[PDB]
Amino acid sequence: AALKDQLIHNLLKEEHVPQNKITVVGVGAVGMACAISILMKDLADELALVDVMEDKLKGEMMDLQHGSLFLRTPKIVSGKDYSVTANSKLVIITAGARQQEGESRLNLVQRNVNIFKFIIPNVVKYSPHCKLLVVSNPVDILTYVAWKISGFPKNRVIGSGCNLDSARFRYLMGERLGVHALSCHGWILGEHGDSSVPVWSGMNVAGVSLKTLHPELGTDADKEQWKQVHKQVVDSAYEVIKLKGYTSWAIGLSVADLAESIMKNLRRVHPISTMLKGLYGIKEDVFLSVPCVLGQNGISDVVKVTLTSEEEAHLKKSADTLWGIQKELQF
Amino acid sequence: AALKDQLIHNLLKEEHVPQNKITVVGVGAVGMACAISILMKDLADELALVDVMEDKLKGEMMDLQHGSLFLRTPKIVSGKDYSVTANSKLVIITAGARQQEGESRLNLVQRNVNIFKFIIPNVVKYSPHCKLLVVSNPVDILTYVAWKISGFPKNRVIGSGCNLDSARFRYLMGERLGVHALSCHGWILGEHGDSSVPVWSGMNVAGVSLKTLHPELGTDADKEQWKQVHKQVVDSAYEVIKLKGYTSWAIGLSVADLAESIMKNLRRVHPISTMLKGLYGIKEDVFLSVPCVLGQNGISDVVKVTLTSEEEAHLKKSADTLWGIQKELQF
Amino acid sequence: AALKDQLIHNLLKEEHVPQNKITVVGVGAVGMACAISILMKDLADELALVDVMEDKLKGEMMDLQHGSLFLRTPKIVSGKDYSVTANSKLVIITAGARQQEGESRLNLVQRNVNIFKFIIPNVVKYSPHCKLLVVSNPVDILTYVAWKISGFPKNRVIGSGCNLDSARFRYLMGERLGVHALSCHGWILGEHGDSSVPVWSGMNVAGVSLKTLHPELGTDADKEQWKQVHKQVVDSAYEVIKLKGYTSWAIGLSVADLAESIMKNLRRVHPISTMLKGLYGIKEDVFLSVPCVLGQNGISDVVKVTLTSEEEAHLKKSADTLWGIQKELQF
Amino acid sequence: AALKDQLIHNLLKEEHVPQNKITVVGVGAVGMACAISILMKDLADELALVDVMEDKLKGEMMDLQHGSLFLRTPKIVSGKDYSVTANSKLVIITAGARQQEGESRLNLVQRNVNIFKFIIPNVVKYSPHCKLLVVSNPVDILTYVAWKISGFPKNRVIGSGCNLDSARFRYLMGERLGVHALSCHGWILGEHGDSSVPVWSGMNVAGVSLKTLHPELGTDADKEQWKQVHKQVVDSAYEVIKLKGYTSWAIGLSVADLAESIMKNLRRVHPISTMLKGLYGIKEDVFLSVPCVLGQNGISDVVKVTLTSEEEAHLKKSADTLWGIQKELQF
Ligand SMILES: NC(=O)C1=CN([C@@H]2O[C@H](COP(=O)(O)OP(=O)(O)OC[C@H]3O[C@@H](n4cnc5c(N)ncnc54)[C@H](O)[C@@H]3O)[C@@H](O)[C@H]2O)C=CC1
Ligand SMILES: NC(=O)C1=CN([C@@H]2O[C@H](COP(=O)(O)OP(=O)(O)OC[C@H]3O[C@@H](n4cnc5c(N)ncnc54)[C@H](O)[C@@H]3O)[C@@H](O)[C@H]2O)C=CC1
Ligand SMILES: NC(=O)C1=CN([C@@H]2O[C@H](COP(=O)(O)OP(=O)(O)OC[C@H]3O[C@@H](n4cnc5c(N)ncnc54)[C@H](O)[C@@H]3O)[C@@H](O)[C@H]2O)C=CC1
Ligand SMILES: NC(=O)C1=CN([C@@H]2O[C@H](COP(=O)(O)OP(=O)(O)OC[C@H]3O[C@@H](n4cnc5c(N)ncnc54)[C@H](O)[C@@H]3O)[C@@H](O)[C@H]2O)C=CC1
Ligand SMILES: O=C([O-])CC(=O)C(=O)O
Ligand SMILES: O=C([O-])CC(=O)C(=O)O
């Protein structure tokens, strides 16, 4: 004579299996920005949260659960034990140390490799068929580490890479031209960070090449100093870190953009971090951002951008640098 | 001979006035959760942020701007000067002062009052026709303060009140009954906080009154202790604060839900705080939560809930309490 | 040498297995309204359309495909062969004869039964684990037919039932009370059509019983004639058909609302048609609308509404009528 | 003691002026596709419908209104009298004449001019500050007619033009290359119809010029017959009309995309029809599609695409053709 049984006649016993489950590992500033953006876009029917800080983890789960009335994601769970992540379609890794003022992303590598040695084997134990989307920095090296530790085929291990760098670039381009970032096109490839490569030849509005219109585009002799736009992209994370201490909102939206292509099988092209040995002249097994076709099987194809020999030389050097960092990691 | 002029032929001298602008005052955790929720629901054509901490304010603005590609809000602005808020349709106040240094809370409430003495006159000078939505705690007193300082008619000064408390209640009801919060209906009215009034008579699923089905509902004599659920709602913000240090996500989602009713003129009913002198037996200038019809002119109507004499007595006690605190403030 | 291969390096060959596929059978007025509503709510990663009219089917598929840029459903497929429907999560049946002006949904029965004799065995052959959502009229009898022909457990065979009748009722109530339909609650149960049952006791705003406030609600002696609102609901399909020839938009939105609860596992309560024997006093195998909990396994629970002796008598006579038709059908 | 007055205490006399109103003129298949697309994107707080067929018009309004529960547009109105359209921000014209047996093509165009001679003065009388968006065919000529009759500045009169042709082109490109239409870029300019101009130089994926990679792109001898893709675009409407009798869904989505840029002030670039005299080598008052920056003041800027002499020559011949049809017309 419980109220529930007076009210509700049960017709079916429910061994609930999740169908569109996403996990976020690390519920820091980045992790929670990814979680709220994914929740507000209705990409998942179950969201699992993992962290090592147990009280913070339960507090973040509860705060999200209290907003359930306003969401269309019926189940949010969390735990330190990765059993809560079982049968995820997509596992997003945002755990780790972050930059202080003046610190390069590459200075984070030793701390975050050691964290990944713990995280990745636990992920693959409960979700052996998931896609891994790596956001923790340095993202290109850590996508390689996730790949090696997981044993996954390379199509299922993705780094957020330069998706956000390109979005920042398009925003800054739009502010200068007086149009929305959506209508500005421009690709930043290579390392997410100081050594990223702007592809000046591809920048356009409505298929009109900016460089064809303004041949000094991207050079030091440019009176409008468009080269500084890329410098603002490179510097932007450092400037936000100095002002507010960290970055979170933009990366959350960028990660949810990637999750949407994966979860809906959109086969959109994004500049994300993938194993590009054998492409673009690279001979080592390094992860760099190039335009990739992203869908329900991860990265299925890569677009072959025509680079100048200078643009190609920048990528070739990055690959050497990153491969040099990778070579001496113990995992 | 600039690139913009090579690319773009300007046909129209642009004198921009925003049509659907929202301002958030305070870029703490609550203010930024409101802003991200509003941005992801496409409620505004311009978002303005204001705070007194200039560096954090610029950093939060830039972080949102870098996500523009992923949004459909084309203009995000910020500044210490309220000229950036001009012509807002809706202004959301989340600013407040921190209150734990061996200090009386009567002095604290007074410090938040002094904060509002600066904010509200600046808001009304640049947006004299806006709706004001007060989220800062203690929300019922500060909604009153905003109303007195602004000189706005009462339909245009709204407190977030018990909107989130009711949502938390519906979530917990649904966890107990095995259905989504959307399908559990239940109203927490009165003072936001420890003395809020759960309206047991109205709680229902599918129009079925739970109290008619379970006449013990809301008493201590209930073997199932549904009264404890209201206690859980009252305690939830404290529990989240103890675990993660503050709350943000649920309040942000709840505020964006109120903003949606306002901006789209939906005339949905929400439990929010309104000046209820002359209603529900109240004779003083106090704000408490009742079900209100919310649209483009703010609160246009109040639903008259049939309360028990006990429930009505709770509301009148709160009203006496609030009026006693307010009388010893200064404007 | 081909352009595609100069442009794109393929990194893996994968066979497409859809994860969130929906099929619509019948691409007439109702089917296409369902299709556009589902596409604009992003509920599917693949939409399959089936009809017997081959030119119309290809024309509707092509017209949706040309709008791909504006959608986030990457694959729209169609054909007369049910192989295109393989592995659907949800199959929506909108095929069959409709009401000519004045005619009861009941004279359609045998013609639409004959159609289901071909559709349903083809559906279950290619999607043995799907949920079936029957919209074709008379919907309560045809949901029974689909259940008998399919051999599916009753939780996976759903009729659109009174979801739309209740939505129409809430709209009309809101018009009279000056509030959005979202905030008006009221349940129409039983037969979709002339013999549906309004549950006056459950009608409410903000948990305030209208009947408690207005005792003649639902009686002939009511000076406001609220009973005429239920007659407007019963008559609405007839009035729209007389004006424009058929109805489509409202049913499409109602079906997409049901599809959303299923695909996202929301466990929302909807008034839909389910096999009711053993509940509400019914003795025979009939389908009628009661509040059902709807999720990824279909209908898992039923809300037990407390009915008046008169309301219960109406349901029992409907059950008798329906069983009277079913007894006479031939598959 | 009416029920409404028992239930609701009115606080405010409603001088309701709509803030985000859209009107659709013509409720045939195209007009209703525009309406449902606009409603499901939450672009308007009021939708007004107008037609000359009073019965069909009332039936379509009622059918949309019955779906209010599932929408977030609180007011849908309709009528033969243009008073229902007052204070629209945007008026979409989809009305047109039905061709006759043995009716010269020019006599038909004159019958659409005669229609516009009635519609446009009524629109501008009740919404003198609106934007006009013309969809009726032949769209370049009728946008000119609307501009002349309205007396509006050219920034406020927009033709749907080649927006949908370019979307069809991108869909077809994407089918051939294996990526989403979103990631394929390509512009069809000029006259909507058989003489539109595909801008081969601008076609790209990820900023990679297909013409640079495949320099015979767009020629007759191209073993990949990419020229045939344009021919498919110009023919696609006729193919769909032959199969299903009319086209509606893609144009509806296309129009709602334009309405979104206007209503949200996005300043996105779209290929739409604008009064181009003085640009692209054109000397007469004609409307042609070029990439335009679209926002709350209509078309504020035009992108200057670098065309080949051949493409440029095609545009000028269209302008000559159109100007010759117009000077014939009686206003
Ligand atoms: N790819 C990109 O564009 C960007 C990446 N990041 C990076 O994301 C990472 C996190 O940044 P924030 O969220 O700001 O830091 P945070 O300090 O707010 O949170 C980091 C979380 O990682 C958790 N964590 C640490 N070890 C863990 C473990 N073994 N297992 C599970 N969780 C663990 C921590 O408990 C903490 O809650 C950093 O590497 C940051 O550099 C930050 C912004 C943009
Ligand atoms: N009503 C509700 O349901 C809840 C309301 N809150 C309240 O919201 C308020 C803010 O909470 P948090 O964002 O976590 O605090 P916080 O400390 O993170 O940020 C508060 C912001 O207010 C700013 N501020 C102080 N003086 C200002 C002034 N003159 N002008 C403009 N800004 C000023 C501060 O610079 C700070 O950025 C608090 O009063 C909190 O109790 C907390 C969550 C839910
Ligand atoms: N449950 C509700 O509230 C509502 C239900 N309806 C019903 O929906 C059903 C469809 O109505 P409309 O779309 O207006 O009719 P319609 O005539 O426009 O389309 C019916 C489609 O069914 C197709 N069809 C016939 N046999 C088929 C078969 N073996 N396999 C596949 N497709 C087949 C037809 O070729 C046609 O395209 C009717 O029974 C109608 O009464 C009408 C509106 C509301
Ligand atoms: N520009 C584009 O890309 C596309 C535009 N169209 C065109 O849109 C227009 C409508 O096409 P459909 O909806 O399929 O035609 P339809 O025949 O279904 O509807 C035309 C509507 O206009 C109404 N109408 C006639 N005179 C009127 C007047 N003085 N005032 C108000 N309404 C009036 C009619 O009563 C009718 O309801 C046509 O010109 C069509 O060729 C269709 C294909 C794509
Ligand atoms: O973690 C950071 O803030 C640095 C970074 O990758 C970014 O925001 O671009
Ligand atoms: O007390 C606080 O700071 C938070 C609060 O009002 C809530 O989340 O209910």
Numbering used by the authors:
A (entry chain C), B (entry chain D), C (entry chain B), D (entry chain A): 1 to 331
What did the original publication write about this model?
L-LDH is allosterically inhibited by its substrate, pyruvate. In order to test whether structural similarity could explain the allosteric inhibition, L-LDH purified from rabbit muscle was co-crystallized with oxaloacetate and NADH, or malonate, respectively. The structures were solved by X-ray crystallography followed by molecular replacement, and refined at 1.87 and 1.58 Å resolution, respectively (refinement statistics in Table 1).
Further, oxaloacetate has been reported to inhibit L-LDH as well. Malonate and oxaloacetate bind L-LDH in a similar fashion as the structurally similar pyruvate. Oxaloacetate forms a hydrogen bond network with R105, R168, H192, N137, T247 and numerous water molecules. Electron density for malonate at partial occupancy was present in three of the subunits for the crystal grown without the cofactor NADH. Both inhibitors bind adjacent to, but not within, the active site and interact with the same amino acids. However, no inhibitor was found in the interface of L-LDH when co-crystallized with oxaloacetate and NADH. Instead, sulfate ions were present in the same location interacting with R170, H185 of one chain and H185 of the other. Moreover, we find that, similar to malonate, oxaloacetate is a non-competitive inhibitor of L-LDH with respect to pyruvate with moderate in vitro inhibition too (Ki=2.30±0.22 mM).
